[PDB]
Amino acid sequence: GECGAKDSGSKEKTSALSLSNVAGVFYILVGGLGLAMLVALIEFCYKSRA
Amino acid sequence: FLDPLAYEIWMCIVFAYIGVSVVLFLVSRFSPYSESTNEFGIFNSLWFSLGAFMQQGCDISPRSLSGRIVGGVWWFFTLIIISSYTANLAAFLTVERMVSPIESAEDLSKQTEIAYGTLDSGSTKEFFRRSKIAVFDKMWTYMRSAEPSVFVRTTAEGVARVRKSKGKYAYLLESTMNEYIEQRKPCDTMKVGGNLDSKGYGIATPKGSSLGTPVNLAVLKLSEQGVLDKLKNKWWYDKGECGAKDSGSKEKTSALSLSNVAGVFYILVGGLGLAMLVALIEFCYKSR
Amino acid sequence: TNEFGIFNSLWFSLGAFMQQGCDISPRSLSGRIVGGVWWFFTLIIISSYTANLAAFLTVERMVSPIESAEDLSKQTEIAYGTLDSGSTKEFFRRSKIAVFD
Amino acid sequence: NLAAFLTVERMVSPIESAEDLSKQTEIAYGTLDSGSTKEFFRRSKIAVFD
Amino acid sequence: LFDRGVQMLLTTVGAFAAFSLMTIAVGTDYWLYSRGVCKTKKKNEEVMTHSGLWRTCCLEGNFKGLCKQIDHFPEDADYEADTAEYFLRAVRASSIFPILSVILLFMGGLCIAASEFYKTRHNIILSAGIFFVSAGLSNIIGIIVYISANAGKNSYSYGWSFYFGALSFIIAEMVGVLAVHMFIDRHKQLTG
Amino acid sequence: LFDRGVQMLLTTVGAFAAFSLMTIAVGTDYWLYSRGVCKTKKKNEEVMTHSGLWRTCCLEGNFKGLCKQIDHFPEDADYEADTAEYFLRAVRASSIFPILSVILLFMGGLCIAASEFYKTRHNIILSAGIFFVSAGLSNIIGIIVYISANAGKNSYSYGWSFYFGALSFIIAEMVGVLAVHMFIDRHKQLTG
Numbered sequence A: 001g002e003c004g005a006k007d008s009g010s011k012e013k014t015s016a017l018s019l020s021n022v023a024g025v026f027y028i029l030v031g032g033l034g035l036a037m038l039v040a041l042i043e044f045c046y047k048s049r050a
Numbered sequence B: 001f002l003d004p005l006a007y008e009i010w011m012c013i014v015f016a017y018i019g020v021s022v023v024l025f026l027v028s029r030f031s032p033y034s035e036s037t038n039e040f041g042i043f044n045s046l047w048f049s050l051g052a053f054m055q056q057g058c059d060i061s062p063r064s065l066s067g068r069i070v071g072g073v074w075w076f077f078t079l080i081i082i083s084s085y086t087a088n089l090a091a092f093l094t095v096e097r098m099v100s101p102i103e104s105a106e107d108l109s110k111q112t113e114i115a116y117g118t119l120d121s122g123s124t125k126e127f128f129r130r131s132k133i134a135v136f137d138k139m140w141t142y143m144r145s146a147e148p149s150v151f152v153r154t155t156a157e158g159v160a161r162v163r164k165s166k167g168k169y170a171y172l173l174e175s176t177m178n179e180y181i182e183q184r185k186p187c188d189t190m191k192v193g194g195n196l197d198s199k200g201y202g203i204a205t206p207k208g209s210s211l212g213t214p215v216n217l218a219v220l221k222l223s224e225q226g227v228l229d230k231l232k233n234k235w236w237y238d239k240g241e242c243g244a245k246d247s248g249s250k251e252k253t254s255a256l257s258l259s260n261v262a263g264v265f266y267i268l269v270g271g272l273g274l275a276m277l278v279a280l281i282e283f284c285y286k287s288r
Numbered sequence C: 001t002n003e004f005g006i007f008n009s010l011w012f013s014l015g016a017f018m019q020q021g022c023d024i025s026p027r028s029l030s031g032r033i034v035g036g037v038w039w040f041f042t043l044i045i046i047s048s049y050t051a052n053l054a055a056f057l058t059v060e061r062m063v064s065p066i067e068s069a070e071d072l073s074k075q076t077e078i079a080y081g082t083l084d085s086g087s088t089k090e091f092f093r094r095s096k097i098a099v100f101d
Numbered sequence D: 001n002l003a004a005f006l007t008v009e010r011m012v013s014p015i016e017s018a019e020d021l022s023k024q025t026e027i028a029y030g031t032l033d034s035g036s037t038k039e040f041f042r043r044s045k046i047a048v049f050d
Numbered sequence E, F: 001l002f003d004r005g006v007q008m009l010l011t012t013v014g015a016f017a018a019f020s021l022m023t024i025a026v027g028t029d030y031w032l033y034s035r036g037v038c039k040t041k042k043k044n045e046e047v048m049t050h051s052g053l054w055r056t057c058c059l060e061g062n063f064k065g066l067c068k069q070i071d072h073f074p075e076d077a078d079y080e081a082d083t084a085e086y087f088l089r090a091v092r093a094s095s096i097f098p099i100l101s102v103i104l105l106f107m108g109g110l111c112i113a114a115s116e117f118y119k120t121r122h123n124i125i126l127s128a129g130i131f132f133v134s135a136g137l138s139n140i141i142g143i144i145v146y147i148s149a150n151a152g153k154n155s156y157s158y159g160w161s162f163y164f165g166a167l168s169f170i171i172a173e174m175v176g177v178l179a180v181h182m183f184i185d186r187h188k189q190l191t192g
């Protein structure tokens, strides 16, 4: 049986949420934190002119 | 109350909370040149980001560049995370999870507390009397040595012995017996697992009786006409007059009982005991 | 320098339950333990309420006992019958529709 | 709407039982020629099968 | 509050009133109306039952006032391997948090005397306030463990002796507040 | 916070601890304990499967210690149409983020030593602090792409090397906050 996924396509409405499908919220969060660190460092480098 | 979210989700939520808190403490309090221009010390940022996660008013707000972006994207994150969590919270409470102790029909052959056995003078015994599949051989070896004699005189006696032994005795019987008896009032018994083999019933005669061939031809014509299935429905599946067929079609009423939620009140009362102790230690520290 | 006398604690701890913000955060370390404990307890309770209410607020209609005589022809738990000396009884007396027979 | 989508993360699954299939021209169905299945539809007189 | 002196009498009479309601609640034979039996097998089907904390009792049956101390029973099809249920069994077969609340509320009722006798030999008066409040928390959890057992749908109705638990909970914590009102000034008498 | 001196010892030992745990987590043969097959074409047996970051092994089957590089080879035509899923697959195949957490935490964990050579420059600590923070951010994205690729349950549990990874995140950012505390001393000496 070297191909079958054995997925019937059931309907049970108590299936826990998949972290993979949520994940892009975390990818956005991490991209935001990184861009924030960038903006903080460049604003500090500007403020260091004064 | 935490069931709707995978435990890896709760883990990554805790680490994302930490990874926001410390980045607000880094981006604020960054010597924005005395320098006292940001209130977001680490314990304040660690409080803010909790309140933002819980969508609860927070007096402090960054107002700086690059800290106000951390806020903006921690709000965007937490809106969508609790939007999803809330949607399934109440749903994941009234589940009544199944607790079947055995599944593989082989877990019986690993233990000596769930007793099991077979009908005396029947195919349910002859199959173990013949079948050299070593799991079934060890099963038969137990069944032929466990006192008191795990056999029973009748299927009705085995169906009784299950109730005589709270399901700590498993009765073995052919599937067409089990998936009938499970469906009969009060339906206190239940099937587990698959089937150990694929035998079947046959009409029998003395050897060479003249009925053998016309009976075979009749059985075949009754199968080709589709009579044997409707005869089976007439006695097994239509007569599901009981809680198994009913629960296959009928479900509980609504509302929400306390035991669904009692864990929140427990961790609450614990949290208040902890808060009291963690301030009393600090008070007595200053007292000495 | 610490506002959380009784009648402020008793108001914060309500404005946090009703998810409408609060005048001020607690600043005591333990005051923030009891703050986070309350914010979690409320997020559970008034998420469970608001999710469950969404089941109730759809419509009321009654599934009723099984119609079509589907289950009536199959279980003894609902009895039924017909008028004696009647055309309906004669119809059951004669019909070859399998459920009716 | 998100709370409608997250009622279950599963496919809809297709029409079955050949009821609508035996009651539409939109999807054809058929059987193996010279097969016991074709012979079964030939001689078995269950109303849906005829 | 005003009336600086009689606050001591008010809080101590409050403590004794709470302690009285608490001990009556823990001592009362009944706690809720329910279906059941006077003795743990009326033994045929039921008798209208007024089940208590450590007891069950009954009314309007073939005998009345035949109350009995309540115990535990052998579960079936296991389902005790979910040992939080066994944790609940232990926390239910022994009324630990409610009886601890009695002892804590009594311990507060002793410690509050250190307001005036051997007065304010360190902040000891504060400890009484913690004991009053600790009795409070013990009631809420003691209630919730009790209901999270006996609700297993419930269809019952709660009795006045249960409301004596809820009311003695409220009074114990309000005595806690008033004991802090004592403490905050007895501290300034202890320390200026 | 305690004395400014032991903060340096604590920062450097924290950086050491996090770096050791993350490199071990990167190097360890296993991250989770599961079931399946470590190598086939074993297409008729199943083996308890014991898979790490870039390498995998198996045990308690008919053979043990047949360790191998991680099973994260390409997919059926890689579905460049589902470019976001290929991106996930490629990012977890070109497993940059955990070795980047190593590399960042390496550079920060050494850079903090130049708090005491060329001392008080207070910008060398800032670059260390930024990398201490960025190492934990790089760890968190690394964790999520692992589990998202896993979910691209089958009776499995995360293991010691995985809890070391998470423990490396916890400590690396504690070092990050401790570095900022040392910064907001040494730089405020210049700003007043």
Ligand SMILES: NS(=O)(=O)c1cc2c(cc1Cl)N[C@H]([C@H]1C[C@H]3C=C[C@@H]1C3)NS2(=O)=O
Pocket (backbone or CB within 6 Å): B197, B198, B199, B200, B201
């Ligand atoms: N379990 S199975 O489908 O592979 C399967 C199914 C069947 C088997 C044997 C097996 Cl292994 N033999 C039976 C026959 C054997 C004897 C017993 C019943 C009949 C006579 N027909 S069956 O019931 O169709």
